[PDB]
Amino acid sequence: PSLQDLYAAFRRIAPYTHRTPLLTSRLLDGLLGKRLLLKAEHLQKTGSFKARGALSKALALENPKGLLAVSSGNHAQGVAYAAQVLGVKALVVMPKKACARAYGAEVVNREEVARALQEETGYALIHPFDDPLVIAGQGTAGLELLAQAGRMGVFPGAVLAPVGGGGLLAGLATAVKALSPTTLVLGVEPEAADDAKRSLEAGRILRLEAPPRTRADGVRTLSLGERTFPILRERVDGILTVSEEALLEAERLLFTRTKQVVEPTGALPLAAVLEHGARLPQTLALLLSGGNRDFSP
Amino acid sequence: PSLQDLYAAFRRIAPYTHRTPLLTSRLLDGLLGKRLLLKAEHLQKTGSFKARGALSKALALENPKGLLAVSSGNHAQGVAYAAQVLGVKALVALQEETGYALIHPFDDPLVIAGQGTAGLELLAQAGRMGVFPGAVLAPVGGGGLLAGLATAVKALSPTTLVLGVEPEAADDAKRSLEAGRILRLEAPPRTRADGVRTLSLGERTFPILRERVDGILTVSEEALLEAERLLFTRTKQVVEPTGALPLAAVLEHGARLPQTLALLLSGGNRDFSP
Amino acid sequence: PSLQDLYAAFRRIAPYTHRTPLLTSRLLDGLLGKRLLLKAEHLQKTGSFKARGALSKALALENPKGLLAVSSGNHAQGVAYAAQVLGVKALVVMPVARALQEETGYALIHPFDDPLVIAGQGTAGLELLAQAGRMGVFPGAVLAPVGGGGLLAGLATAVKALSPTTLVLGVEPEAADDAKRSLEAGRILRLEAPPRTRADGVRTLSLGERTFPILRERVDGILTVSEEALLEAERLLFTRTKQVVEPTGALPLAAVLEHGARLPQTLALLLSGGNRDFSP
Amino acid sequence: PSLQDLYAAFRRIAPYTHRTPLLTSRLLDGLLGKRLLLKAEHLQKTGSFKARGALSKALALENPKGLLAVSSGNHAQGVAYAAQVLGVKALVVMPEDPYKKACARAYGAEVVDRGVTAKNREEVARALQEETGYALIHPFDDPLVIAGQGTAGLELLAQAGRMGVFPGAVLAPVGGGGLLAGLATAVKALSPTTLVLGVEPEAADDAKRSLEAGRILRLEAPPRTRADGVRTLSLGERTFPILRERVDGILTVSEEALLEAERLLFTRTKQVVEPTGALPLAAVLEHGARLPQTLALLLSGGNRDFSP
Ligand SMILES: *Cc1c(COP(=O)(O)O)cnc(C)c1O
Ligand SMILES: *Cc1c(COP(=O)(O)O)cnc(C)c1O
Ligand SMILES: *Cc1c(COP(=O)(O)O)cnc(C)c1O
Ligand SMILES: *Cc1c(COP(=O)(O)O)cnc(C)c1O
Ligand SMILES: [Ca+2]
Ligand SMILES: [Ca+2]
Ligand SMILES: [Ca+2]
Ligand SMILES: [Ca+2]
């Protein structure tokens, strides 16, 4: 999508989503020797940035009968919420479950199950990342980030976000490069599931043989999407990988220092600073993608 | 202390502490059928409101050799940060030895005055929003916070209810107010709210409570846990068990409390769980 | 009135008034060797702080039939605004009224000699301290214009209740220093006739009976200013901050121009109003 | 220029300019039947938006020897301010015919007044340039100046976005076209359906005439109007092509409407806005019926002299 697509997406979803804050922490800054800007999407409607993509697509549909969604978990809640906003029914096909079911969505291998439903109910299928309107929606988070950083008079040398299917990164990259092409846009992946990094270097989409094995449950995707890959090839500077150990440490830091509840895959950007800090610029914007983790006393 | 003491305290500590935000959540509101205002002290320096009290007292001393504290938990950290700010030593009989100044966690005027600054902020912030709470709820241990809070609130709007909250298995402050005298637990209570396992209210806080507090509510351990869960999952905020007591009270006594409530999230220093 | 009266007043009028900004001007701070905090009451409803006092009194009346007042100018608009909020009729007698009082039975809202009016004006003082605290700035003094004494009395009550060490000072044109003279004599001295000054808002013949004792106990002093300084201060606010402030609202700045050297470095100034005629 | 140029200009000038507020007034919205968003450039450093353009060009210069400018108003102050930031000297040429010279000199700029007049000023400056080697900063016919002015448009959309209000049209005054070209670029790049309209005194509608014509049309002599900041005899060479393709139209307003516009802002909002900075509000007064419901108005400046 283009920059205009992103702005139009912002206009459509603005009244139903939060202008999440760009948090800063002197504690973290001082411990890591960096100037960090934390885009708080864990404070977004439904607990993650996914509400943006789902609403962007749902509100552009002309008189749809209902909404249909694969799974993901976070995307399920996003679609359910959008279903509420439009006042229609939402059917979710999952393999985050209780929450989705809560928003008034009936939850229910994958692909074939959805296909048979899309024809059966006639609802609109909302893909979690391989849809132009969905990508435009996720990207609005990038438009905001720049505006907020601008208001602060702080310009990051790099923007770090997690990558699974690539919807968020593709959207973020489109926003950043259209305004400041010299700003690095970096994706982050668990080292145990680095098909995106390998795909980008080889110029072709490589797929993981089997489900990874990482605590970042939001990016256990087998491969990048067909629509997101070409955008990443053109606008993303690189992809960094992190160990499970560093991811755990990143979560611990957010939890204990900023008192924010961020789910594991939402902590990948911080993990990357922990392991590759010396090779990154001084001022970094981190996309805390979600805060939907289970409670434990 | 008086209202002028609290403001005097605010001035001393303002540069070293955060003007904590007053959070609102449409999820909690719609869920509890209330209008809740959450004073986020878990976002205060060191992770709890204790920083205010420690700083309030530390900055009031003339040439302090060092600072001394009787570890209770969050107070230890508060006193450490204070020493740091002053650029002196913090250690949590060593008094006569090194001559360090002892900072009690709740039974000291300047400490109580410091905790109270949270009450002054709450009111100004609510006032800017144009929202006036019918009641302010805060957890109670030794009574420093509740005493400071009551002082700020009653001095400005005596019709606003100031309610303390404590776990049912450690309801000494409630029964102490009932008997017009201090009662004391014989042994540490069995409760998840490790921040309020105090054996009794302080001697300097008790009188302020009988005079300025409207009552103490008790909560079950089950209600506490649920309050923690709602805060965790719905507001995505890390609040330690003791800081979720106010919300636990709304869960168990909602029907008999005002429609608009100010809750004091006293701290966020809870251990990380993978 | 009491600090609690100011807060109750704040609660009554909050919904119908503006929490006006506490403005800061790097330029001004630069031109003067000071750090100035400008309470923007010129941006309040009706154009002046008066809206505060009018609504405080008016919203506490039990089933008022209508409102009537000794029209001073800005007060007239405040009372008129208050009547619109209540939904009753406002009768203003601008250059008698008591007859209309008996006739209609309307409530008379005095411009300054009324506890509820004073309490109302005083809410600007509660805001000022709250906004300044949020900024982490603590002024060594607060300066405000003095006519009837309502504003200064309310302000003095708010500031002294929280920080008595903070200086509270009134300011009036030298051509009308009756309030100043009164604080010296310990009695209410009156002006032989209109003082004639550009600060039209404070050309009252004497301090009020309910405000005078509050001032004698809560006001640290009153400063007088020449008409030349007033004009200068008025030109400064106009060209440097681009704010339309009426002459009387510029008195506190004029005092800095003439007495700066003997005032603390950080000062809070109350810009009382911005209701001046337009002139291309 | 380009949207990236605008953002680049923003980055360069950000630390030395104000992110001026997007003011809203219940009163104004009441009088007119509109939702008005007022971009307060009168609150910008030096009193007008021109500080943006000036800094944008000046900060981009390498090892400048000094700054030079030929202006009869606000641009002079902008350049002088820019010169203070760089730490170099500023030379301003203005005809020997107000107090606006005092402000320029206030920012530490040297003013060449001697026997200077219109038509003659350009030659005097060219000569001063040749002699000093100082860089000349044009008030509107320079890509970096236009990019700088356009940053106001970037802020405007961000601020509007933050409050969730999307203007159906943006209105700004038109003199040389720098402000309008920069604003049109920012706005059209993000949302093309959003109307961008200029406003000029009807006694100087050369811009409106040029856009309808297809080429630049100049004025015989100095126009007669209160709006002193837009008495430019004609649009600029670099701004005109941008306007022709990125501007939806130009509105003209009576001197009567302008005066009322100024009165309303002065009395209702308590803001000191110079007459030309009031043109956008005047357009609403006279053409409100043909404009959308939600309008963004560019209050270009607040540099009018004090009047007791
Ligand atoms: C969906 C999701 C991601 C991954 O985004 P992709 O568009 O699939 O790259 C990352 N973090 C969280 C919390 C998510 O929900
Ligand atoms: C210390 C503490 C309390 C109780 O305060 P007292 O002044 O001792 O009543 C409550 N919550 C937390 C998180 C604390 O650290
Ligand atoms: C009424 C008024 C004053 C004077 O206040 P008193 O309460 O009468 O002392 C000063 N400035 C303005 C703009 C006023 O309207
Ligand atoms: C210079 C100026 C204008 C006109 O801008 P142009 O870029 O020359 O069209 C409008 N208003 C004010 C206050 C100005 O200074
Ligand atoms: Ca992967
Ligand atoms: Ca107890
Ligand atoms: Ca007098
Ligand atoms: Ca023209």
Coordinates of C-alpha atoms in Angstrom, one line a residue, chain B residues 27-270:
Chain B
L27 CA -13.2 -1.8 30.5
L28 CA -13.1 -1.8 34.3
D29 CA -15.7 0.9 34.5
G30 CA -18.1 -1.0 32.2
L31 CA -17.3 -4.3 34.0
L32 CA -17.8 -3.0 37.6
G33 CA -20.6 -0.5 36.8
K34 CA -18.5 2.2 38.4
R35 CA -16.5 5.2 37.4
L36 CA -13.0 4.4 38.7
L37 CA -10.0 6.7 38.9
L38 CA -6.7 4.9 39.5
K39 CA -3.9 6.8 41.1
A40 CA -0.9 4.9 39.6
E41 CA 1.7 4.9 42.4
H42 CA 3.1 1.7 41.0
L43 CA 4.6 4.0 38.4
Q44 CA 6.2 6.1 41.2
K45 CA 10.0 6.2 41.6
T46 CA 11.2 2.8 43.1
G47 CA 7.9 1.1 42.3
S48 CA 5.7 2.4 45.1
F49 CA 4.5 5.5 47.0
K50 CA 7.1 4.8 49.7
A51 CA 9.5 7.0 47.8
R52 CA 7.5 10.1 48.8
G53 CA 7.7 9.5 52.5
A54 CA 11.3 8.5 52.6
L55 CA 12.3 11.6 50.5
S56 CA 10.0 13.9 52.5
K57 CA 11.9 13.0 55.7
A58 CA 15.4 12.6 54.2
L59 CA 15.3 16.1 52.6
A60 CA 14.2 17.6 55.9
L61 CA 17.3 16.5 57.8
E62 CA 20.2 18.9 58.4
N63 CA 23.5 17.2 57.5
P64 CA 22.6 13.6 57.8
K65 CA 25.5 11.2 58.4
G66 CA 23.6 8.4 56.8
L67 CA 20.1 6.9 56.5
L68 CA 18.8 3.8 58.4
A69 CA 15.7 1.7 57.8
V70 CA 14.0 -1.3 59.3
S71 CA 13.3 -3.4 56.2
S72 CA 9.6 -4.1 55.6
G73 CA 9.8 -4.2 51.9
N74 CA 9.1 -1.3 49.5
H75 CA 10.3 1.1 52.3
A76 CA 13.8 -0.3 52.0
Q77 CA 13.9 0.8 48.3
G78 CA 12.4 4.1 49.1
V79 CA 15.0 4.9 51.7
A80 CA 17.8 3.7 49.3
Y81 CA 16.7 6.1 46.6
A82 CA 16.6 8.9 49.2
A83 CA 20.1 8.3 50.3
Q84 CA 21.2 8.2 46.7
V85 CA 19.5 11.6 46.1
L86 CA 21.2 13.1 49.1
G87 CA 24.5 11.4 48.1
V88 CA 24.9 9.6 51.4
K89 CA 24.9 6.0 52.7
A90 CA 21.8 3.8 53.1
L91 CA 21.7 0.8 55.4
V92 CA 18.6 -1.4 55.8
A93 CA 21.9 -0.2 67.3
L94 CA 23.8 1.0 64.3
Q95 CA 22.4 4.4 65.2
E96 CA 24.5 5.1 68.2
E97 CA 27.2 3.5 66.2
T98 CA 27.3 5.4 62.9
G99 CA 24.9 8.1 64.0
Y100 CA 22.6 7.5 60.9
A101 CA 19.1 8.8 60.9
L102 CA 16.3 6.3 61.3
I103 CA 13.3 6.6 58.9
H104 CA 10.2 4.7 60.1
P105 CA 8.0 3.3 57.4
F106 CA 4.8 5.0 58.7
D107 CA 5.0 6.4 62.2
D108 CA 6.7 9.7 61.6
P109 CA 5.1 13.1 60.7
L110 CA 7.4 14.0 57.8
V111 CA 6.9 10.5 56.4
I112 CA 3.1 10.6 56.7
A113 CA 3.2 14.1 55.2
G114 CA 5.1 12.7 52.2
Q115 CA 2.7 9.9 51.6
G116 CA -0.1 12.5 51.7
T117 CA 1.3 14.3 48.7
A118 CA -0.3 11.5 46.7
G119 CA -3.6 12.8 48.0
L120 CA -3.0 16.3 46.9
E121 CA -2.1 15.1 43.4
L122 CA -5.2 12.9 43.2
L123 CA -7.5 15.9 43.9
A124 CA -5.8 18.3 41.5
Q125 CA -5.8 15.7 38.7
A126 CA -9.5 14.7 39.3
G127 CA -10.3 18.4 39.4
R128 CA -8.6 19.0 36.0
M129 CA -10.8 16.2 34.6
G130 CA -13.9 17.7 36.2
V131 CA -14.5 14.4 38.1
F132 CA -15.2 14.4 41.8
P133 CA -14.9 11.0 43.6
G134 CA -17.4 10.1 46.3
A135 CA -14.8 8.0 48.0
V136 CA -11.0 7.4 48.0
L137 CA -9.9 3.8 48.8
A138 CA -6.4 2.9 50.0
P139 CA -4.7 -0.2 51.5
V140 CA -3.7 -0.1 55.2
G141 CA -0.7 -1.5 56.9
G142 CA 0.9 0.7 59.5
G143 CA -1.4 3.6 58.4
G144 CA 1.1 6.1 57.0
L145 CA -0.5 6.3 53.5
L146 CA -4.2 6.3 54.8
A147 CA -3.3 9.0 57.3
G148 CA -1.6 11.2 54.8
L149 CA -4.4 10.6 52.3
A150 CA -7.2 11.3 54.8
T151 CA -5.5 14.6 55.8
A152 CA -5.4 15.8 52.2
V153 CA -8.9 14.8 51.3
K154 CA -10.7 15.9 54.5
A155 CA -8.9 19.3 54.5
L156 CA -10.4 20.0 51.1
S157 CA -13.7 18.1 50.9
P158 CA -14.9 16.6 54.2
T159 CA -17.9 15.0 52.4
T160 CA -15.7 12.6 50.4
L161 CA -15.5 9.2 52.0
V162 CA -11.9 8.0 52.9
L163 CA -12.0 4.2 53.3
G164 CA -9.0 2.1 54.3
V165 CA -8.9 -1.5 53.1
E166 CA -7.1 -4.6 54.5
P167 CA -7.2 -8.3 54.0
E168 CA -9.8 -10.0 56.2
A169 CA -7.1 -12.3 57.7
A170 CA -5.3 -9.2 59.0
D171 CA -8.2 -6.9 60.1
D172 CA -6.6 -5.2 63.1
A173 CA -6.8 -1.6 61.9
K174 CA -10.6 -2.1 61.3
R175 CA -11.1 -3.6 64.8
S176 CA -8.8 -1.0 66.3
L177 CA -11.0 1.8 64.9
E178 CA -14.0 -0.1 66.3
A179 CA -12.6 -0.2 69.8
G180 CA -11.3 3.3 69.8
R181 CA -7.9 1.8 70.7
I182 CA -5.0 -0.1 69.1
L183 CA -5.3 -3.8 68.9
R184 CA -2.4 -5.9 67.7
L185 CA -2.1 -9.2 65.8
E186 CA -0.1 -11.7 67.9
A187 CA 1.7 -13.0 64.8
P188 CA 2.2 -12.1 61.1
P189 CA -1.0 -12.7 59.1
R190 CA -1.4 -15.2 56.3
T191 CA -2.2 -13.1 53.2
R192 CA -0.8 -12.4 49.7
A193 CA -0.7 -8.7 50.5
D194 CA 2.9 -8.8 51.9
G195 CA 2.9 -5.0 52.1
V196 CA 0.4 -4.9 54.9
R197 CA 1.3 -7.7 57.3
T198 CA 2.1 -5.1 59.9
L199 CA 1.2 -6.3 63.5
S200 CA -0.6 -3.1 64.3
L201 CA -1.3 0.5 63.3
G202 CA 1.4 3.0 64.4
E203 CA 0.9 5.2 67.5
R204 CA 1.2 8.4 65.4
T205 CA -1.1 7.3 62.7
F206 CA -4.0 5.8 64.8
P207 CA -5.3 9.1 66.1
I208 CA -5.5 10.6 62.6
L209 CA -7.4 7.6 61.4
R210 CA -10.1 7.6 64.1
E211 CA -10.6 11.3 63.5
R212 CA -10.3 11.5 59.6
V213 CA -11.1 8.0 58.3
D214 CA -14.7 6.9 57.6
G215 CA -14.1 3.2 57.9
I216 CA -12.1 0.1 57.0
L217 CA -13.3 -2.6 54.6
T218 CA -12.1 -6.2 54.6
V219 CA -11.5 -8.4 51.6
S220 CA -11.1 -12.1 51.0
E221 CA -7.9 -13.6 49.5
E222 CA -10.1 -14.7 46.6
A223 CA -11.3 -11.2 45.9
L224 CA -7.7 -9.9 46.0
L225 CA -6.5 -12.4 43.5
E226 CA -9.3 -11.5 41.1
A227 CA -8.5 -7.8 41.5
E228 CA -4.9 -8.5 40.6
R229 CA -6.1 -10.5 37.6
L230 CA -8.4 -7.7 36.3
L231 CA -5.6 -5.1 36.6
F232 CA -3.1 -7.4 35.0
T233 CA -5.2 -8.5 32.0
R234 CA -7.4 -5.4 31.5
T235 CA -5.2 -2.4 32.2
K236 CA -1.9 -4.3 31.4
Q237 CA -0.4 -2.8 34.6
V238 CA 1.9 -4.6 37.0
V239 CA 0.4 -4.1 40.4
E240 CA 1.5 -6.1 43.4
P241 CA -1.1 -7.9 45.5
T242 CA -1.1 -5.1 48.2
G243 CA -1.8 -2.4 45.5
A244 CA -4.8 -4.2 44.2
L245 CA -6.7 -4.2 47.6
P246 CA -8.7 -1.0 46.7
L247 CA -10.1 -2.7 43.7
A248 CA -10.8 -6.0 45.6
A249 CA -13.0 -3.8 47.9
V250 CA -15.0 -2.6 44.9
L251 CA -15.6 -6.2 43.9
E252 CA -16.9 -7.3 47.3
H253 CA -18.6 -4.1 48.5
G254 CA -19.5 -2.3 45.3
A255 CA -23.2 -2.1 45.9
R256 CA -22.7 0.0 49.1
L257 CA -20.0 2.4 47.7
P258 CA -20.4 5.6 45.8
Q259 CA -20.6 5.5 42.0
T260 CA -17.3 7.3 41.4
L261 CA -14.2 6.1 43.2
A262 CA -10.6 7.0 43.4
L263 CA -8.4 3.9 44.0
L264 CA -4.8 4.1 45.2
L265 CA -2.6 1.6 43.3
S266 CA 0.0 1.7 46.0
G267 CA 2.8 -0.3 44.4
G268 CA 4.0 -2.5 41.5
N269 CA 6.9 -4.3 43.1
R270 CA 5.7 -7.9 42.5

